[PDB]
Amino acid sequence: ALWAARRGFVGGNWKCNGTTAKTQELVDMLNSAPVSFEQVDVVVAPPSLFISQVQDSLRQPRVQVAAQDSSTQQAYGAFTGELSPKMIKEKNIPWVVLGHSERRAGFGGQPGESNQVVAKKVRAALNEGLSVILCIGETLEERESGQTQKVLSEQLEAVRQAVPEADAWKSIVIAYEPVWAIGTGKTATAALAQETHRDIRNWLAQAVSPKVAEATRVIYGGSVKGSNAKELFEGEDVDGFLVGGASLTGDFVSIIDAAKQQA
Amino acid sequence: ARRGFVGGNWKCNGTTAKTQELVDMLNSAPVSFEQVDVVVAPPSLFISQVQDSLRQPRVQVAAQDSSTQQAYGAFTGELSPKMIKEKNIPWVVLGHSERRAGFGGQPGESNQVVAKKVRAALNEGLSVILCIGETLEERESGQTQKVLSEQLEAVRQAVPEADAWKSIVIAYEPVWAIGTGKTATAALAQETHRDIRNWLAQAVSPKVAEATRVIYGGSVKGSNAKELFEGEDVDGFLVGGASLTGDFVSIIDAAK
Ligand SMILES: [Cl-]
Ligand SMILES: [Cl-]
C-alpha cells in the first residue's frame, strides 16, 4: 500500500420505503452517477424484499448491499420472520445495519432491542463473516443533561462484552446518529459531530485498542443532506455518513461526493 | 364447503439454490392442486425469486410477518403491509408462536401487537394466516380455551367488522407440537378446532364460523395428515419442517 488512512464511507438506509420500480430507479441512479466512487465505500440498505433485485442489476463493484437488521439467531432454523446472519451471508449480502434507534425504540407497542440484544446481533453477524454498521446515539434529554459520553460508552461497552476479541472489530463501522437529529431537520453542527466522534474514537482506544481506534470508520447520521455534508466532513474523526431520507433521491450522490478530501 | 388449505412456512431456512429446488418441486408436483389452496412462505429475501419462477397458479406466496407500521416511512428493518401488498404478495403469516415468544432476550409480540399487525394487514388488502396456540402447561392446567379465546378476542377488538374476517385463515398450533415430533392426536385437534369455530360463531357471527378455514400445525407429516384431516373442523394444515421437502406434496394431497 502507499497510504494508511481510513477510507470514506457513505451508507444509504432506505428504511421502510421501496417498490420494484423505485428500486430500479435508485439502482439506475447509482449505475449512471457521473461522480467517481473510487475513494469511498458506498453501501445501500434496501428493504429485504428488494435486496436480490439490487444485487442482480447493480453494476458498480464499489457499491455494496446491506440488510437493515439481522437476527439474534445466528444460523438456520425455526425462527419465523427472522433473517439470520448465516442466511444473509450465504445470499452474498456483505453488510448489515444493527441497532438503529428506530429498532432500539421498537414498534407498535412491542419493546425494542436493548443494548444487550443489539450486542448479541452484532456478535452473531461477525461470527458469520458479515460487516456491520453499528448504530449508537443519545436522546435530546441525555444531550442537554451532559450525559452523551456516558450513554455512548454504555451502548458500546455492551457490544464489547459480546465481542471482546479486538480482531473481530475490523469489520465494524460505527454510525453516530443522535436521536434528536433523526427525521427532525436538526443536523448536528460540524463542531458537535467532530467532538463526539473523537469521544467515540477515544472509547475504542481505551476499551478495545489503539489499532481498532485508528482503523474503525465513525460515520455521522441524522438529517444529512448534500448541502450540509461538506462542512460536516471537515472533521478529522468524521469518516462519512449514514444517510436516511436523502438516500431515496439524487441528493445521495451529492453526499457521496462530499465524503472526499481533495487537495 | 370450506376449501382445503395448506400453508408451508419455510421459517429461517433458504438459499438461492434451495429456493429453486422447492419451486421446481412445486411446479412438477404430481398431485392436482384443484381442490386445495396452497400458500408458501419463504424468507423475505427469496420471495421475489419464488414469484418469478413459480408456474402453478394454484400456489400463492406469503411473507412470514408484517409490521405494526402500516404504510411507508421511517421503520428500519420492517416490512409494512402496504409494501408487501404493492410487491403483489397476497398473504402474510401473523402471530406465530416463535414471534409471540420473541428472540434472543428481546420481548415478543403480545396479543395486542399481533392484533395491530392483523388490522394493518387487512386494511391494506392482504389475507392473513393468524396463528394461535397454547403451551404444554396451559394445556395440562385446563386453560386451552381461555388462552385461545384471549388471542382471538384481541384480534376481534382491532378488527370488529365481521366482513374483514373473510380474508383470515386461523392456524391452530399447540406450542408443545412445534418442532418436538409430538403431533396432536386427530381427536384433540378436531375438538380444539370445534372450540375455535364455536368461538367465531358466538363472538363474530355464524357466517364467519362456517366460512373460516381453521388449519392445524405442529409436527405435521405426510404420514399423519390424512388421519388429522378426517376431522370435520380441520380444514388443512400449516406445515413447518416438512415444507422444505417432498413430504409437503403428500400433505397437500391429504387436504383434498
Ligand atoms: Cl439512517
Ligand atoms: Cl409453522
- Which residues in chain A are closer than 8 Å to B80, comparing Cβ atoms? 16
Helix, coil or strand: residue B21: helix
- Among B98, B109, B124, B173, the one annotated catalytic: B173
Ligand with smallest separation from the Cα of A243: 1
CB atoms closer than 10 angstroms to residue B30: 6
PDB resolution in Å: 2.0
- CA triplet A175, B84, A109: central angle to 5 degrees? 60
Which residue is closest to B180 within chain A, CA to CA? A78
Is residue B173 part of the annotated active site? The answer reads yes
Nearest C-alpha in A relative to B52 = A53
Q: Are B61 and B19 in contact (CB under 8 A)?
A: no
* Cα–chain center distance at B118: 12
Technique used to solve these coordinates: X-ray
Closest alpha carbon within chain B to A101: B76
A83: CA distance to ligand 2 center in Å? 16
Walk me through the domains of chain A, giving residue ranges and CATH numbers.
1-263 (3.20.20.70)
Going B186 to B191 to B194 to B200, the CA torsion angle's sign is negative
Three-point CA angle A233, A235, A238, nearest 5°: 65
Determine phi and psi for A96, rounding to 5 degrees. -135, 145
Instruction: Enumerate the residues of chain B whose CB falls inside 8 A of the CB of residue A107.
Output: 67-69, 75, 78
SS3 for chain A is CCCCCCCEEEEEECCECCCHHHHHHHHHHHHHCCCCCCCEEEEEECCHHHHHHHHHHCCCCCEEEEECCCCCCCCCECCCCCCCHHHHHHCCCCEEEECCHHHHHCCCCCCCCCHHHHHHHHHHHHHCCCEEEEEECCCHHHHHCCCHHHHHHHHHHHHHHHCCCHHHHHHEEEEECCHHHCCCCCCCCHHHHHHHHHHHHHHHHHHCCHHHHHHCCEEEECCCCHHHHHHHHCCCCCCEEEECHHHHCCHHHHHHHHCCCCC
Contact A111 B116 (CB under 8 A): no
- Please report the number of interchain residue pairs, chain A to chain B, with beta-carbon separation below 8 angstroms: 157
A123 touches chain B (CB under 8 A): no
Whether B124 contacts chain A with CB within 8 A: no
